[PDB]
Amino acid sequence: KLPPGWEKAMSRSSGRVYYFNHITNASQWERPSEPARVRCSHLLVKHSQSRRPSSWRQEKITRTKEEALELINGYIQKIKSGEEDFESLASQFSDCSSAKARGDLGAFSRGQMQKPFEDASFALRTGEMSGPVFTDSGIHIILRTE
Numbered sequence: 415k416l417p418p419g420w421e422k423a424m425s426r427s428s429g430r431v432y433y434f435n436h437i438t439n440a441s442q443w444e445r446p447s448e449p450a451r452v453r454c455s456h457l458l459v460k461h462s463q464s465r466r467p468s469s470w471r472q473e474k475i476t477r478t479k480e481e482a483l484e485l486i487n488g489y490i491q492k493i494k495s496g497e498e499d500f501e502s503l504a505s506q507f508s509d510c511s512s513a514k515a516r517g518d519l520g521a522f523s524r525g526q527m528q529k530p531f532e533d534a535s536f537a538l539r540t541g542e543m544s545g546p547v548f549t550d551s552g553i554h555i556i557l558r559t560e
């Protein structure tokens with residue numbers, strides 16, 4: 415009954431049922447609502463183990479994988495609360511050059527991007543945002559725009 419990747423779970427805090435997606439790492443209280451191409455933006459946070467530990471922000475990326483995840487979780491909280499929008503955080507903080515285009519990567523098909531990125535991208539519906547998505551490049555928040 416649920417879309418690809420989506421499973422039902424129990425909240426450790428409240429005992430209330432929630433839904434999470436094991437492909438996108440999305441999680442929400444609400445029950446969840448294949449194209450050749452999708453369009454996505456992302457916000458990338460790199461760490462010391464990233465394939466290329468360097469960006470326009472920081473010549474030498476030193477942060478730990480754990481500290482990168484803390485950063486990602488913080489940005490997700492601010493996006494979800496409405497305190498900051500995705501585009502503004504991507505522009506300021508993404509370790510990808512796409513930061514200069516508010517994180518926009520344009521449109522792409524399967525067979526183009528790192529696999530965990532692609533799979534998360536194609537499991538989102540238009541408008542939906544992922545949780546933390548891990549690739550060899552670092553940790554991503556992905557917004558599907560088309």
Ligand SMILES: Cc1ccc2[nH]c(C(=O)O)cc2c1
Pocket residue numbers: 458466509510511527528531549551
């Ligand atoms: C999957 C994916 C998407 C965008 C990306 N940007 C980068 C970078 O090194 O700037 C890696 C990467 C990987």
